Amino acid sequence: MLVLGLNGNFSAADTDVVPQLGEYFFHDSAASLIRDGELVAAVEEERLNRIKKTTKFPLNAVRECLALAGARPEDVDAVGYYFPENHIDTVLNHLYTEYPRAPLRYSRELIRQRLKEGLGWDLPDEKLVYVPHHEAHAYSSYLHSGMDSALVLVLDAAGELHSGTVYRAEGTRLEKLADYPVPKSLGRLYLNATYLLGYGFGDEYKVMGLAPWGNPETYRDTFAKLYTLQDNGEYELHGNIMVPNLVSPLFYAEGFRPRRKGEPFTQAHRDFAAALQETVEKIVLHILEYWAKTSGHSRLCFGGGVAHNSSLNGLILKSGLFDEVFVHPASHDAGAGEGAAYAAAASLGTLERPGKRLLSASLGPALGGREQIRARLADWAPLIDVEFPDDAVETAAGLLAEGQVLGWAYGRSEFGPRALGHRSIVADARPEENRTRINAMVKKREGFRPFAPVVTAEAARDYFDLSGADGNHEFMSFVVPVLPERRTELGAVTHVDGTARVQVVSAESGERFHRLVRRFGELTGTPVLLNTSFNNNAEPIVQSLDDVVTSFLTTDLDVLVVEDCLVRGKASPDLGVLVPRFRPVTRLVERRTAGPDASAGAKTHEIHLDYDGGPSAKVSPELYELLGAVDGTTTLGDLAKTVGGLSDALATEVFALWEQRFLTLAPAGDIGPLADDGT
Amino acid sequence: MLVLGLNGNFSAADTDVVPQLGEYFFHDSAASLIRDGELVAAVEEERLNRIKKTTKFPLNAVRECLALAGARPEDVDAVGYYFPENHIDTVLNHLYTEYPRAPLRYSRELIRQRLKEGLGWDLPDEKLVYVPHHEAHAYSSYLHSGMDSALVLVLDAAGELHSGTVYRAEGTRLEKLADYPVPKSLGRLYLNATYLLGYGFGDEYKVMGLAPWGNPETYRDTFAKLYTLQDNGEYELHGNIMVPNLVSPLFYAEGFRPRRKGEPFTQAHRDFAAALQETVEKIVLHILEYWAKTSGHSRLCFGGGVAHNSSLNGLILKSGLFDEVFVHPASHDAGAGEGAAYAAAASLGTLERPGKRLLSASLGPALGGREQIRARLADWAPLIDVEFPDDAVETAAGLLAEGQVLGWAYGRSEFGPRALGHRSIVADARPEENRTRINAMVKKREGFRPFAPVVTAEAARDYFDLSGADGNHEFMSFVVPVLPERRTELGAVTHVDGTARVQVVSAESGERFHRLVRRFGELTGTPVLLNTSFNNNAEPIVQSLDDVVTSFLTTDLDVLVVEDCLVRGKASPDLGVLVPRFRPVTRLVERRTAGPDASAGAKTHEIHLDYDGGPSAKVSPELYELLGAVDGTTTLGDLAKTVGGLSDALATEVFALWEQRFLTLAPAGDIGPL
Ligand SMILES: NC(=O)OP(=O)(O)OC[C@H]1O[C@@H](n2cnc3c(N)ncnc32)[C@H](O)[C@@H]1O
Ligand SMILES: NC(=O)OP(=O)(O)OC[C@H]1O[C@@H](n2cnc3c(N)ncnc32)[C@H](O)[C@@H]1O
Ligand SMILES: [Cl-]
Ligand SMILES: [Fe+3]
Ligand SMILES: [Fe+3]
């Protein structure tokens, strides 16, 4: 029983179905593959087209999943899509009325066209199954829990009918107990508020990170005017007719000032985050207190995008409402993509389910075999120095004990937003200094952002308070207090309220990463490391060896450990050997605007990425002339010859474009097809 | 007592308050000036910045109104703005949360900044008055009616609180009788439906013109699912939670396929428009049947943007529900700007009002004095031939009788969307082939579109069925039946259903235009002309002399009559003497996207206008190089020398960009102050 689960919109690599298609129109595209009831492969398209939370059709994700499964497209028994057909087609139809030049192609025709043109795959109509959105979420969260029965709660921003749903799950059977309508979305509430802080879609985790720095008393009475808790676990959100934002009109009327780009976070801003987080917590605990008592159940699965609020999950864990709580690594729409595969199989006979609780999210493409990796690392010679230690974990453990910050790339990439030791950046977890050192310098993000610890299963309870229930910690789903007697010891991974988004690694969840942290513990007396995602501020988590090396070379990391090779950056790297390549969304433009006196203004030049929210950057006339000749094969050095050579000024200008990922820059050729490692 | 009325957003000429500010965020910007109760000047900003239904701050309109009144900024006693302060600021606040780079400037600071930087006018806080939106519509529509008591209905997309409001008016006082919430908007319903016919904001009256070609029965039962009439003049619209469009999900579920831009209008499209138009008529007449008998009024003023639905007005006229009906020429938000002035005046003293029913919309800037018009037409000599007939009206009537299609430009431009004899295109109303060609060749628009007649007041009842109530026909507010025995004769202006959006012109409403129509009637026996607005498909109604000549030369008009000068295009027009200028929104781009094997794709060049909805067009490599050197003073002939002479292909390529208004082309100099 081999079933593809699909989520996201339908745009091609280089264009969107409607020009500048909204980034909120079916985001976090992904593909999942199940076989005989198990999740055999899953990867978000963002890892492959390098567009954070992309909406584009997950064609690459499908190709990669089929390769990991050793399947042809025609081997696939069914395809599940994470919304009902009439709902997606109604939304598409609405986009088409707003863009009258777009041809009338609805989801079924588009899915078949993308697979046909992309994979030579001729999908028969009977193999495509469309699925209720909250059902998809519920299957994904509950079926990987290892539980045989559970209360299931789903809370997200937009199901077709509901923003919230409560189920009773038993075996492979879901029974809806309650629902909440779309305008009551707590995910929409959170996003609406997030905009008042100078942030936008995808920044919710930043707002959650900020909230402990604020006082929830300041705006508590203001938020009280936006919701009311009611009997039987009901609530209302109080809308308005003025703007599509629940929160902005009232806060404007009380003098709140939305944060501007590049501005600092005032105490008003910090307190707003704190009150927003406490609001969503109170409503969800209101829901769960009622449905715990009413259903009688002791086990909870929590899905939907809202279940990436690990602070909320920590409060659910400590509430004492449940004995067990499970949360999936990909609880946002990529998880509904997986769930849709299971719902498609259920629609076509009895449902085969996973045999055990999910412990590892290592499910995307691997980096490649040792032969092809070495070969490719050699293409990078003009830029890096490679060692081959005897025990790369031992060497890495010592280097971390020495105080270095490591890139750590091994095996199959993580499904969902957290890095868990397959595409990670790791450092010593004890010195506070590592916080501003990694935030400001190497990862280039805001300072209030705390860092997440990874600890061995054996030492977990010597450092963290996991009480209140038995939650799953392999995926950093839960924020838990750090025990007071360990707070100062864990100076880098302890938030202001003494809490931490802990990963608990085991020989089961990740043998190599468990070995690393254990071995570090023996060397140091503290088996806890800092673990943050391996990417800079302009890209999602790195996927390929090339992505890994590129990201190493464009951040200030000390050493990179990638499949037992120890990589360092040469003294002066020769950028001239790299071959520049446009991304599918790269645009290069010379512009003239209207001058005063109604002349043609003077030429300016820019590069940008053509998707909604895509970045943009000025380029010098000289780099514009160089980039216009990019052919995909000639090296940067050789292209620069046409403008007098790759001078230090040009190389610096190119490097800064590289850091923002406007172009692909890598040695000639590729690493070739990913080899059969025999697993 | 001198009061300025304002409406629109606050964007400058070249930038918008937020980048790509949506075209619906405070559109139809305009300024109005009232002195001693009388509307002395009014013009929409679109006529001056040449962006249809523009949202930009009406800076040029304010300056032009002050000049027409002979007033200085410091003379203005008050300024009214057509929405409450908190409402417009809440919307601005929302846009700022979506665009965190934009600084937190709200409407009071923005309005005073635009006036100070734009006019040198430091406006004190106490002179700025914000006004309820439907109250502003109501004042405008009622105070110009000539009536001393009336029922006043306002229907539009949305005021700050309501989609519709019903008032009692007596003397100068408005008292509210009823209101309808924002989700019940009939304006929003009609605009939602308009999006299904491949159209957008501003196109509603095209859908209106399509409706008589459709059968209203096909989708009647479908539309019946989106509204319910209730007792005592109430009604409800049934929304949905999938998409922000009331209409599209239901019609999708029944297999409706929204027309694509540049595809024909199928019979299902036509039937869709006909059922839509019937639906809104049913609901409005339901509202008005209740409130006429309840309020006791025999007279009705109807305003708000929905009052530009001339078909609806004609059914209100024939309904027998009222003895009299008045509709203002500018019932959309420009008219709300004017009403904001009256409300501002009322809050700062007693309220002076118009002495008479408004008969003329000729309220914008004029074309200029006779000598500056003659001198400026001389500057255009390399492209035009000019005659100076003894009696231009006499000559024009004869040319019309010989089958010529005339541009007609005189005096002050029309306020509101209809051309009424000051910026008009006119032709013989009799041959049906005139509608076919003027649609295809001159206005360059869809063949289904009807044409509106102008008739003399003395012959109106010989041709049209005006009966029922007494409505005002000076501004083409009402669709009326053409008399059956005249439908054959009026081949070009009788719509498929036998109706016509008539302008009845009189010596009092437009003396010169009336003389033209009367004289044409004397020559031919038919005192009726076709009268369409003087603009091509790429511009709003022409304003200045250079606008009129530009439009004449880039439309396929036979002859232009402008302030008694007879203008025709030269056999070979020398485009090289024209000085190209960028418009403030013109952008010139050389672009590369990704190509094969992740290469840089091949260069392309394009020109575009930088506003939401703005057009774009490809340009050749060599025109791109030419336009890159535009300095605003050098002629196109001199500019083309750098690229090796003004080729015949370059001139042709330039002419087509001129026709689409991507740049300004005009002889050196200008007409000077008017
Ligand atoms: N159907 C659909 O909309 O996709 P989805 O399941 O991925 O839900 C995303 C929603 O979860 C909310 N959300 C996401 N992350 C969140 C976080 N860390 N904290 C609070 N809310 C969050 C987010 O604001 C957004 O409203
Ligand atoms: N409300 C506001 O902000 O400005 P406003 O007074 O100018 O109203 C615009 C509204 O009039 C509606 N509208 C315009 N023309 C229309 C027509 N011919 N038929 C129906 N509705 C029309 C249009 O669809 C739109 O919903
Ligand atoms: Cl591994
Ligand atoms: Fe979801
Ligand atoms: Fe209005």
Numbering used by the authors:
A (entry chain B): 1 to 679
B (entry chain A): 1 to 674
Article passage:
Carbamoyltransferases (CTases) catalyze carbamoylation, an important modification for the bioactivity of many secondary metabolites with pharmaceutical applications. GdmN and Asm21 contribute to O-carbamoylation at the C7 (S configuration) of geldanamycin and ansamitocins, respectively. CTases in class III, which modify secondary metabolites, adopt two nucleophilic half-reactions, the formation of carbamoyl-AMP derived from ATP, CP, and Mg2+ and the subsequent transfer of the carbamoyl group from carbamoyl-AMP to the secondary metabolites. GdmN forms a face-to-face homodimer through unusual C-terminal domains, a previously unknown functional form for CTases.
All multi-site mutants converted 1 into 3, whereas only the GdmN-V24Y/G157A/R158A/G188R mutant could catalyze the conversion of 3 to a new compound, namely 4 (HR-ESI-MS m/z 600.2092 [M + Na]+), albeit with relatively low catalytic efficiency. The structure of 4 was determined by NMR spectroscopy and HR-ESI-MS and confirmed by X-ray crystallographic analysis, demonstrating that this mutant could catalyze 7-O carbamoylation and 3-O carbamoylation successively. The crystal structure of the mutant with carbamoyl-AMP was determined and was found to be similar to that of the GdmN/carbamoyl-AMP/1 complex, with an r.m.s.d. value of 0.26 Å. The major difference occurred at the substrate-binding pocket. As we had hypothesized, G188R and V24Y reshaped the substrate-binding pocket, refining the shape complementarity of the binding pocket to the substrates. The smaller side chain resulting from the R158A mutation might offer more space and reduce the spatial hindrance of 3. Due to the G157A change, the carbonyl oxygen atom of the carbamoyl group could not be accommodated by the conventional oxyanion hole composed of the backbone amides of A158 and A157, leading to a rotation of the carbamoyl group of carbamoyl-AMP. Additional b-factor putty views indicated that P19-F25 of loop 1, D156-H162 of loop 2, and N240-P244 of loop 4′ in the iterative mutant are highly mobile compared to those in wild-type GdmN. Such flexible loops resulted in more possibility for 3 binding. Our study also further unveiled the recognition mechanism for iterative activity, revealing that the hydrogen-bonding interaction donated by G188R and more flexibility of the loops resulted from V24Y, G157A, and R158A, contributes collaboratively to the regioselectivity modulation.
